[model samples]
Target chain A: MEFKKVAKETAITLQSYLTYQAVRLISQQLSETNPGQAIWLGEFSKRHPIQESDLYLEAMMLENKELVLRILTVRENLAEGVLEFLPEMVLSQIKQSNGNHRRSLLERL
Target chain B: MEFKKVAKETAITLQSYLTYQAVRLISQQLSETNPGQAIWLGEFSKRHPIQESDLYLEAMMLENKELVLRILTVRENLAEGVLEFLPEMVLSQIKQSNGNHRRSLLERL
Candidate 1:
């Protein structure tokens, strides 16, 4: 398997799972803070079920415009929490790995 | 807060959590697959204590050479499954974000 593709997908999968968790938390919070809104959200979530495997993309496919925006907002909020670290880590790791590869190659020369 | 720093820490935290999960799974598997090995692993884990917040780096600090290697091996195995996708996703996401930023700037101009 292509390592790059797998890594991207893996990150996506995890992000989707986090999004799923965010929805749950949001629902729980609303349940106590705003019961009417929570009931509406519960119904909307029930209809457009977000599963761990496909929640990221599936959430975008929602037909309700307001719900779609809300889901995206929450997903983005959750993703930003951890994903902000990824770009730097990714570049740093690649640089380190490339350096190691070059050193190993130089040893043979 | 620096988005880059937070992003990196978030990824590291999530990774450490994954490493923690891997240890749990390994322990559970060994419990059934090899009871003798499982007993030793349980003791080792108890002493080393891989927590979600710091398991990734903390594991490396382990004094037991064999246990350290084993933890590293398992951690690598688990990380490889998802991390291979990260580099490409990271680059791809960065490129997209840059494009969006440039377009928005041009639109304002």
Candidate 2:
């Protein structure tokens, strides 16, 4: 695949993957810490099933408000970490990357 | 910084960054779809503080199983996608990378 196409797909792919992670994280916690609600969420999960591959897409199309809120809670918490370093890493990575690749990326930017 | 150190930090960085995006995505969804829970969650969010810089570290060290599980869920799901393509991208990116850089990475590998 072309570099740009691959990069684009990877971004979307990452977003979807993150959504799936959020759901799993919440479900496991509920199962152990709040078994009472775990049963409820368990059934809810089944009713509104998501596969990892399609979790992002499912999240985007979801109609369930409660589930959406739960996902959002975890997701926001997750986002709070190490993001301050992202821009620095990005720049450093580009600097360390191949000259040709760096030029191409910078040209586009 | 050494390339090895930079790469290692960036992997952790990517993982952390992904978590943040997951939260942002979910928050946007909740704000639009269900403002009631949004208000509740907004307050909940204040109770459970996180900065993008510290989110992942907080996640790893969280005593709150609920939050941990939520992060895990999204993380696992996130792992499922284009992770299939990660190796390919890594290989190709290296192949297209600087010759010296490629050789250094391969040597370490």
Candidate 3:
């Protein structure tokens, strides 16, 4: 996938004027490299004048494995942590996951 | 980062029951590996009862470059393609990019 092509399609699908602007700000965030990027993205999304279209893109920036580790280090402070309440259905899927990945989330909860 | 924590937080961030269900469906799609996964994700979100919260998460799945390339091959059929309307602002950003990635989309337009 060419990054521009994907961004363009995304830009098209999220047609809101606000979303257009939001994508710019968030893309700027992603362009800036850092070890604490996951934390920054999570925080930035929470703090921004975010449009609904921003969710997956914003969260995905935090999807890099290394950055996720940083977010994990401070998991308790994150919305996904035990301090936060996940949807019951989501929790159930996590519980049912046969993968160690699912178990890992269960371990924290 | 532990995938669970991220999923859990995303679960929590997206608190709606509909979002819970949507995440489940989308996550399941991701779990199944396929060359056409990006297309599935992009089409799925467009077709699902997607919440505003679902945007970033949904779009993120399509962020994979290989999947994006698939989408790119069929870009004209997509919302981002010139066939669809994108916010003028977003189009401007694409036009202004220093990278060929940006030019690429411009070329298609």
Candidate 4:
């Protein structure tokens, strides 16, 4: 039960991190095309601290965006009893992708 | 280039840790069997600092041996761009093994 609890907590942390990444990407994309969205973008961006300098942040943001897509795609494939967040189908799809690719995507997402 | 450099560095660190682990297992086994081996074993054992108590050390040694074997087996599968230590076939064999089992083997090794 403790392992499951820990796994659940880990899943939540992962999800939160992922969600923050997703929002960050959305903000960056919108910053270029939809300046009007800056208010909401700033709100979400404030929640996820980008710990890197401008250069590293740029790279990380790009990577996280990619990860967001991959995670969203794979969230369906996660098996039961593993994590409570993503569905099995999405998790499976994500796992189907290579680790490097998945991590790359996560960096952007 | 920097990423490759980082990966290479990580691989080395991983190998060093793994090797330390292998030597540690050998020492433990020797401790139980041939106390005479303790002198030489101590030499190698001294190279690795056991951060935990005997109980934890036991668990870790078990885990490390499994990892050592798995890594040795998978060393062959690692691409040329990756670490330059083990062969690809060995790495592939390790990779083929299940994670839990590989870890278990490391504990005994």
Specify the highest-DockQ model's number: 1
Candidate 2: CAPRI quality band = incorrect
Model 2, A30-107: lDDT tens per residue?
Answer: 888888776765665576544342443233334444555566555434433322333345444323332333343344
Question: What's model 3's interface RMSD, roughly to a tenth of an angstrom?
Answer: 17.0
Q: List, residue by residue over B1-109, the lDDT tens digit for candidate 2.
A: 3233333454544554444544454455668987775565456556654334244324333433343344444433443442444444433332332243324334642
lDDT of 1 by residue, A1-109 (tens): 5434435545554554555555676777778988887787777667655544243333334433444445445555555555645644644553453354334434642
Best by TM-score: 1
Better of 2 and 4 by lDDT: 2
Q: Estimate each model's TM-score.
A: 0.41, 0.32, 0.20, 0.24
DockQ per candidate: 0.12, 0.02, 0.07, 0.03
Q: Looking at candidate 1, what is the lDDT of residue B38?
A: 71
Candidate 2: residue B80 lDDT (0-100): 41
Off by over 4 Å in 2: A47-64, A80-109, B1-109
Error of 4 at A40 (Å): 9.6
Candidate 3 Cα deviation (angstroms), residue A101: 30
Better of 1 and 2 by TM-score: 1
Runs of candidate 3 with Cα error greater than 4 angstroms are A1-48, A52-109, B15-109
DockQ of 1: 0.12
On lDDT, the stronger of 2 and 3 is: 2
Better of 1 and 3 by DockQ: 1
lDDT of 2 at B79: 37
Looking at model 2 chain B, which ten-residue stretch has the lowest summed lDDT? Answer: B93-102
Say which prediction, candidate 1 or candidate 3, comes out ahead on TM-score: 1
